[PDB]
Design a protein around this ligand. Structure first.
Ligand code: HEM
Ligand code: HEM
Ligand code: HEM
Ligand code: HEM
Lengths: 145, 139, 145, 139
């Protein structure tokens, strides 16, 4: 549940997000920091070193898709459960991804946003984005509930 | 904690330098804003923005982290008193340490772009988890 | 969701559960094994040693209450969310209990049932009871979702 | 851990004796039944009730736990090859180690009532968590 000011701040910061690199950066950092998540991405080629992970075009292409899904969720903050129904089905029934990894990826994305925006990523903006990523993770984990 | 992790952590926290207290206060503020349930551990604290109590607590936490970095191979012995506090007297829920570690990582990312590479991020995450499990090891 | 076989097994085992000591044993073991949970029960008196915890009349009475709530949830397996609405409000918006402790207490209760029933607590019965305790914990943590 | 934890764990696991393989197989069966998502790590395994593959894997896990008990103060060095396996090749999610530890605790409770006191339960929980974090150390 975001207040109108939190929503305005979130949508103002998201408008300046590079949609071609932020998702790839978040996915690569997830793979580097929690390398058991690499088990889900063996078909992505070389993942042995952090440089190879962040240089992987498949990781960049997938991160772009994940960032697009996050943008879709951000455009539907009041219908997150219905927005992520098919993605929840895919991630739970088909891929067997533990729901703690959703929270991990959301926190990695928060860290990536902080890294890119620096001082303008204020604590109130981060709190609103934590609300957003918690909602997204909860919506994606619904099929386990 | 591999030796590579220790090497990465020492340089990254060395470039923190004299901004450690400010970074700790900012991480505490971020934790209080993002996770208000953590505020229940500080009922006697003035927890508004710019609070001198929060500033002093951030300096203390930053100094503890600096000592932990200086004693990375002997952290359980170096943090015995803090573990005693946090586990016996405070008995803080271990999820709060994950929350504070995440806020510290966010502060470091927002203040040190060049230093916050993915490998340094992984090393800092592992170091903060080790510090957290040392501080909860007395349970 | 439980199959009719799982429901029958769970009901048959729960009919033999001693409602005066099982909840107290579960609460005491939760306090001993996860001593940070003692922060929520500082008005119960002496909790300094495991024997003092297991001999605490306040802990025994509160465990009786918790076991009664578990029986209430077991009598309504398709409406756990509505069965635990007020308890969820109390535990989240009033007590600020982190939802991981709900799963911890459910697993402690499973261990207590295994301890009491021995070979009767077969792996299928345990799987059904894990489903039950997961549902109860999810229903109790609804206010955080 | 603590000296008391080590003593309790040593006594409890000594009381396991020659039923270690049976207890490990039963814990594996309990984990597969209660948490079917753990089955994805064994796609080449016959995972039905009474399976000889599950029996052998349970014997191996029990022997590893016995070695860890015998080397409780040097567990990270004693379990280096197993941690290498589980972290590099297998890449097991850490949540799965919590699930297996819970199933081991359930098996121990259902087979050793007198030994499974609250203090022994706490010590076994701590020991299994230490084994799990050693086996996930390489990440
Ligand atoms: C937390 C928020 C997440 C979002 C919004 C998200 C989004 C997506 C999207 C949009 C797709 C592509 C679906 C399609 O093309 O039809 C996808 C697939 C996938 N996701 Fe995620 N994801 C998340 C978390 C995760 C995590 C944490 C993991 C693993 C640890 C993961 C593993 C995968 C995999 C392996 C695929 C490939 C599925 C396939 O190729 O069929 N996801 N996800
Ligand atoms: C890396 C993690 C942490 C470090 C390094 C740390 C360090 C410290 C230090 C140095 C002190 C002061 C000790 C003294 O003055 O003698 C302290 C006190 C305290 N800490 Fe932490 N801490 C951490 C995590 C946490 C978390 C996550 C919480 C709660 C959510 C917490 C709650 C407290 C409280 C309530 C006090 C007492 C403050 C007072 O009474 O004035 N700590 N900690
Ligand atoms: C997981 C399943 C749980 C169930 C079914 C349950 C059930 C209950 C019940 C029936 C009450 C009494 C409410 C009343 O008398 O009005 C209660 C209160 C309480 N619960 Fe729980 N509980 C659970 C978990 C927990 C956990 C894990 C903790 C702490 C770590 C906790 C802390 C408390 C406390 C401190 C109270 C007393 C507060 C008050 O009465 O105002 N509960 N719970
Ligand atoms: C209590 C902690 C655990 C211990 C002590 C343990 C011990 C072992 C041992 C001794 C082996 C055999 C290695 C060899 O042949 O030399 C093994 C293999 C394996 N373990 Fe574990 N393990 C543990 C937890 C887990 C968990 C939680 C999973 C995942 C659900 C897992 C999945 C595997 C797999 C997939 C293999 C390879 C099986 C094969 O190909 O034969 N282990 N483990």
């Amino acid at each position: 549940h975001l207040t109108p000011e939190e929503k305005s701040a979130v949508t103002a910061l998201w408008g300046k997000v590079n949609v071609d690199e932020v998702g790839g950066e978040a996915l690569g950092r997830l793979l580097v920091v929690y390398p058991w998540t690499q088990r889900f991405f063996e078909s992505f080629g070389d993942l042995s070193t952090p440089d190879a992970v962040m240089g992987n075009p498949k990781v960049k292409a997938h991160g772009k898709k994940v960032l697009g899904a996050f943008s879709d969720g951000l455009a539907h903050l009041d219908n997150l459960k219905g927005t992520f129904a098919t993605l929840s089905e895919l991630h739970c029934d088909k891929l067997h991804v533990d729901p703690e990894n959703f929270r991990l990826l959301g926190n990695v994305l928060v860290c990536v946003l902080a890294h890119h925006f620096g001082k303008e990523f204020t604590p109130p903006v981060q709190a609103a984005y934590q609300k957003v990523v918690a909602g997204v993770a909860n919506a994606l984990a619904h099929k386990y509930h | 904690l591999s030796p590579a992790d220790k090497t990465n952590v020492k340089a990254a926290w060395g470039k923190v330098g004299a901004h450690a207290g400010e970074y700790g206060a900012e991480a505490l503020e971020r934790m209080f804003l993002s996770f208000p349930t953590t505020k229940t551990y500080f009922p006697h604290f003035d927890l508004s923005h710019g609070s001198a109590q929060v500033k002093g607590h951030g300096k203390k936490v930053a100094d503890a982290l600096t000592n932990a970095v200086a004693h990375v191979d002997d952290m359980p012995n170096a943090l015995s008193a803090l573990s005693d506090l946090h586990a016996h007297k405070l008995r803080v829920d271990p999820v709060n340490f994950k929350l504070l570690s995440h806020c510290l990582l966010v502060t470091l990312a927002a203040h040190l772009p060049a230093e916050f590479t993915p490998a340094v991020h992984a090393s800092l995450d592992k170091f903060l988890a080790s510090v957290s499990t040392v501080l909860t090891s007395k349970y």
